[PDB]
Design a protein around this nucleic acid. Sequence first.
RNA 1: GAAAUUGUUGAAAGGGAAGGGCAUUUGAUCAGACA
RNA 2: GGAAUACUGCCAGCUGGGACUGAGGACUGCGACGUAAGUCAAGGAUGCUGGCAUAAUGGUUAUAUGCCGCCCGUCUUGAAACACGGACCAAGGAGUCUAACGUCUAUGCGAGUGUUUGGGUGUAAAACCCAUACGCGUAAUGAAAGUGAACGUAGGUUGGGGCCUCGCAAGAGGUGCACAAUCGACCGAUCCUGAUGUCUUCGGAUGGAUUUGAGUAAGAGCAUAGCUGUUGGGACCCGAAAG
RNA 3: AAAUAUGUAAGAAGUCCUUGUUACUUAAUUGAACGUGGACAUUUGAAUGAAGAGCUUUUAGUGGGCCAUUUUUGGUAAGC
Lengths: 51, 156, 222, 148, 185, 53
Amino acid sequence: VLKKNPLKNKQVLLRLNPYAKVFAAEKLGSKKAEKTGTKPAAVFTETLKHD
Amino acid sequence: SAQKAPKWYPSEDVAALKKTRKAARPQKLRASLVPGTVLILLAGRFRGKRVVYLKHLEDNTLLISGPFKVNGVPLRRVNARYVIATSTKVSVEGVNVEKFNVEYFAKEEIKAERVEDQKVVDKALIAEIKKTPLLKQYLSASFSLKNGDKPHMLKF
Amino acid sequence: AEQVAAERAARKAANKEKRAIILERNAAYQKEYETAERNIIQAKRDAKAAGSYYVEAQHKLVFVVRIKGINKIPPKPRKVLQLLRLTRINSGTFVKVTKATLELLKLIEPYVAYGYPSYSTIRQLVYKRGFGKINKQRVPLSDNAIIEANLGKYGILSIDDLIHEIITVGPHFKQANNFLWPFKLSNPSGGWGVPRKFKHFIQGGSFGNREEFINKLVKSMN
Amino acid sequence: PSRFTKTRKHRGHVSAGKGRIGKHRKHPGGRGMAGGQHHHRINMDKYHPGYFGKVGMRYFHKQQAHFWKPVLNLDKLWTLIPEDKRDQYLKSASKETAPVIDTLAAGYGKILGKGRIPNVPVIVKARFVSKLAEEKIRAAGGVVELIA
Amino acid sequence: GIDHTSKQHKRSGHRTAPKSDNVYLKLLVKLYTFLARRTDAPFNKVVLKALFLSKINRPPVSVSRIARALKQEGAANKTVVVVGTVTDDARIFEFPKTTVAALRFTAGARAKIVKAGGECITLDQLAVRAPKGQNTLILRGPRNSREAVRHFGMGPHKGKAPRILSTGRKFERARGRRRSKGFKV
Amino acid sequence: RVKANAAKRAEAKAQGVAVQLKRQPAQPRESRIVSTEGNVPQTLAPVPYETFI
RNA sequence: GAAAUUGUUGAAAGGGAAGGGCAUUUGAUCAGACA
RNA sequence: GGAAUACUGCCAGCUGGGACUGAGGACUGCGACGUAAGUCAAGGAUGCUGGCAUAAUGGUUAUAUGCCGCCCGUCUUGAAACACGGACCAAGGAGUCUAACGUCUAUGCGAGUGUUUGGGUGUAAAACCCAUACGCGUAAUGAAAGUGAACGUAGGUUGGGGCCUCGCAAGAGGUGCACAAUCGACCGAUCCUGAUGUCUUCGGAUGGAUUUGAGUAAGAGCAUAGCUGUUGGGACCCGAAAG
RNA sequence: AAAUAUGUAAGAAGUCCUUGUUACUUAAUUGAACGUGGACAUUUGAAUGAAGAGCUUUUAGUGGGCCAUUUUUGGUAAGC
Ligand SMILES: [Mg+2]
Ligand SMILES: [Mg+2]
Ligand SMILES: [Mg+2]
Ligand SMILES: [Mg+2]
Ligand SMILES: [Mg+2]
Ligand SMILES: [Mg+2]
Ligand SMILES: [Mg+2]
Ligand SMILES: [Mg+2]
Ligand SMILES: [Mg+2]
Ligand SMILES: [Mg+2]
Ligand SMILES: [Mg+2]
Ligand SMILES: [Mg+2]
Ligand SMILES: [Mg+2]
Ligand SMILES: [Mg+2]
Ligand SMILES: [Mg+2]
Ligand SMILES: [Mg+2]
Ligand SMILES: [Mg+2]
Ligand SMILES: [Mg+2]
Ligand SMILES: [Mg+2]
Ligand SMILES: [Mg+2]
Ligand SMILES: [Mg+2]
Ligand SMILES: [Mg+2]
Ligand SMILES: [Mg+2]
Ligand SMILES: [Mg+2]
Ligand SMILES: [Mg+2]
Ligand SMILES: [Mg+2]
Ligand SMILES: [Mg+2]
Ligand SMILES: [Mg+2]
Ligand SMILES: [Mg+2]
Ligand SMILES: [Mg+2]
Ligand SMILES: [Mg+2]
Ligand SMILES: [Mg+2]
Ligand SMILES: [Mg+2]
Ligand SMILES: [Mg+2]
Ligand SMILES: [Mg+2]
Ligand SMILES: [Mg+2]
Ligand SMILES: [Mg+2]
Ligand SMILES: [Mg+2]
Ligand SMILES: [Mg+2]
Ligand SMILES: [Mg+2]
Ligand SMILES: [Mg+2]
Ligand SMILES: [Mg+2]
Ligand SMILES: [Mg+2]
Ligand SMILES: [Mg+2]
Ligand SMILES: [Mg+2]
Ligand SMILES: [Mg+2]
Ligand SMILES: [Mg+2]
Ligand SMILES: [Mg+2]
Ligand SMILES: [Mg+2]
Ligand SMILES: [Mg+2]
Ligand SMILES: [Mg+2]
Ligand SMILES: [Mg+2]
Ligand SMILES: [Mg+2]
Ligand SMILES: [Mg+2]
Ligand SMILES: [Mg+2]
Ligand SMILES: [Mg+2]
Ligand SMILES: [Mg+2]
Ligand SMILES: [Mg+2]
Ligand SMILES: [Mg+2]
Ligand SMILES: [Mg+2]
Ligand SMILES: [Mg+2]
Ligand SMILES: [Mg+2]
Ligand SMILES: [Mg+2]
């Protein structure tokens, strides 16, 4: 009789999609990606800053 | 007959209500409303009166008093959304106030108990007020908007 | 007569399995998506390290909004706008990109705005404005059994299964996407950018492929 | 009756449902069957091919009566025997005694041969017969006796 | 607005009760729309519609057309249903037994059937014996044997019979009906 | 195409299924890594107005 | 004993027509529902 | 070398102010929180408090004020038109009835149908009853003389609802009315063919043909009634100059 | 020799095997047409859509048109 927005009614959010509970519990929406440091070839940098 | 009469009548059975889902949960008050805080009364009989806040009652109202001997306002209920909570604050650790609830204002002039309750509270408070100079005078004088005052700007 | 709780038991328990299945499935896709996204990120970087260039695959899925009202429209575009189910302004549908639809898009550019939608805007499109076609009618999604009922034949028994089919352009995208009733957006909240809609995006207008800038818009209309 | 009629419904609309432009006027195409060969020829050839001009012989003072001659096919035939009597003759199909049917007395003038009669013998009295009728009749061991 | 792609507020175009005003007809319909809603048997669904049919879409099935249908291979014991009147036909000389279930039987038909020791059943008696229409053989009559349809599609080279009152030589057999008078058809 | 569709089918069926023999439109192309090695980018700009005539 | 149209009485409004629509002030006037 | 920050994007991160709405009316669903009992914001508002209990709210009306609003009817591509009729008001004031019809529909009976020219009868223009004919239908085709509808289970083929059989089901087969397509057979016309025979010119079997018919091929009509349509009638109403 | 327009095709009324009918046709049971019997199901044969599709009867009004972008004829031109 009345459509309820999962995006802003936590109950039906958890009704569709049970993963919402664990997503939120594991923050997950702010995941810290692996810190790696590959550096680009000077080819790349040269031609980026070329004329 | 003047008019035929229908083939169908309504039942006159009232239905029952659907079982509603509306829990009465408690009113958390805005942070500026701690007891001891001085309120400006925005409306009502004692509008623009400056007044000490004492207790949050169970009907959400606020218990205030003048004190009565200062500015003539008695122990009273006031509605939180008609009230500017100032930033100036008396301690209220010496004011009992337990006694005071909704039933205490059951309509049903003035009861001697009220007149005495008023005195016991007000004395604790006055004792306190006197600690900070000019507060009493403050408390005893109506607030108003002076030309140029811009509420959405002033700090209270 | 039993049943009371007896066949209430046969079912609530049965319902519980089904959620578990969804719980592990939606947990799956989360992995699916992250490591997909990350792999591309690492692709780019790996190729730069190597003095090369990682050119992403072209997008296989777009999202079209009809942007033009209903009158004064040539017949060829018209038909197409119907076949893509855009028959009123600000309504939108998903389209799988191949040569044979790509041309269709080409044909209606003056009248639409379209682009590559993100996971985020497909999710919020589906969660809020997403309705099924069920012996016609157009039924809100809002419970997962509505989907399993009609889309379950194809795998697909949750609102997130739906989203997952769309975004990855699954083997059963036709059924999954046709099931979706044309989304009905409001006009953009922020406004349109632009003072005139009916030039191409590129010329300061609103229509055409505007690529990843389609999410900014759709969100303001969803 | 008038109350069910569409002029009741047109009351209050100007043109009585016959157009503002092209009115309802007296006789636009002419009267009657006017123009059959001119402005009404498309309707005539198509819908009435054959209409204009002549064929065959005139016959002055033709008297339909002369040619009176209703057909009855074998198709019925057994109908001209009353039911009761009929069943009685079907069973006991035989020379020596077979039913006499005066088809003139039933007011037909020719027996034609539409389709199958059981093998029972009939004696059939008629003014005329198709070759087939008379053939099919003998094939059941009946005959045709010519009357008038 | 909506670029419509289909005419709005369209009526499905199917009779949905009969136009007839007969109590009894309405009751038979009461019977069968119940059976059609609660028996998933296609027969009940077909019969319900046939009851709405106007007189024309209900040509009379004959007793001889009935007798033939029973000479169908493996069909001689079936009960023929006819949603309409059933007429007699002197042209058949031998009639089977069986059980015809119908709206009306003419005097001659009901006799012929009963004379060979058959049964004439009304559709509602038919229902009580065959609620799923078991073992029934539905027949319909010739719709396009009507005189009217002769004249449908009248035009050049269609061969369809003039709407004509008097007929004979010199009633529409000349110019445009033969090579020697203008042209032909 | 039929003659061939009959082939790929028999060739499949009596092996261990997996067919796919409807036609499909041009798919968009996939990812790819273009190398620079042998082929650094040359940089063009636009050219001025001229008249040759 | 209608209407056009008229006299009187009462009330109103009126800076080169009048009448109308949405809305509310103001005056006048009134139904219902309370128990 | 190591940070920051901007920019863009994400979060099923938290959170404040404001507005409109509160359809529904026992329960039934999907859920959420809880060790649990319970609880809940989970298939649509309840709780608490006050004021009035009447012109207070509301309706009607006149006026005032803001914005807006050209005279309707008509013919026209286009009218508020410097196009026409209309000063005002009442009362009359225009698609009818009839003969014969098409399509559709309802009803009666059905290879038939139609009592009402007439007769009988009557509580008298009614109602009730009826013999003989007639009409239309049940046969067509030829200008005519004239001839006249089964090779066959009243045909083969393809689709076909429904039904029948098998199968738990999906499906598979059997039969298949209406209807549609297609190829054939039958009757008349036309044109070939011309047996047995003959009051030697009659007779016309039989088998055929890019021909042809408003035909056969297990009948569908007859009658009353209605809306719409058709023709003739003063013919929707008013109108000539004329004869 | 374009662009725009435009014909057909994308299967069950389909493809393959076996070998019947005739007065047509072949030097020829050769062919042509129509068949009987057998082999293979929905990735059965591109996309997108499909408030379904097909069919039948009868009848109104209408048969002065005007405008805009583009193509365009006559005219110096025109609110032609
Ligand atoms: Mg509750
Ligand atoms: Mg709170
Ligand atoms: Mg004082
Ligand atoms: Mg699409
Ligand atoms: Mg915004
Ligand atoms: Mg704004
Ligand atoms: Mg903003
Ligand atoms: Mg502008
Ligand atoms: Mg929004
Ligand atoms: Mg009439
Ligand atoms: Mg009347
Ligand atoms: Mg009426
Ligand atoms: Mg009307
Ligand atoms: Mg009216
Ligand atoms: Mg009108
Ligand atoms: Mg009309
Ligand atoms: Mg007029
Ligand atoms: Mg004539
Ligand atoms: Mg006959
Ligand atoms: Mg006939
Ligand atoms: Mg000719
Ligand atoms: Mg008088
Ligand atoms: Mg007044
Ligand atoms: Mg007003
Ligand atoms: Mg309510
Ligand atoms: Mg309610
Ligand atoms: Mg009072
Ligand atoms: Mg009152
Ligand atoms: Mg009051
Ligand atoms: Mg006024
Ligand atoms: Mg104005
Ligand atoms: Mg005019
Ligand atoms: Mg003019
Ligand atoms: Mg003018
Ligand atoms: Mg004039
Ligand atoms: Mg005048
Ligand atoms: Mg007037
Ligand atoms: Mg009048
Ligand atoms: Mg009497
Ligand atoms: Mg008399
Ligand atoms: Mg009598
Ligand atoms: Mg007599
Ligand atoms: Mg006759
Ligand atoms: Mg006839
Ligand atoms: Mg002769
Ligand atoms: Mg004749
Ligand atoms: Mg064949
Ligand atoms: Mg079958
Ligand atoms: Mg078969
Ligand atoms: Mg012939
Ligand atoms: Mg001829
Ligand atoms: Mg005829
Ligand atoms: Mg007339
Ligand atoms: Mg005169
Ligand atoms: Mg005169
Ligand atoms: Mg004269
Ligand atoms: Mg094309
Ligand atoms: Mg589809
Ligand atoms: Mg549909
Ligand atoms: Mg028409
Ligand atoms: Mg017309
Ligand atoms: Mg016309
Ligand atoms: Mg005209």
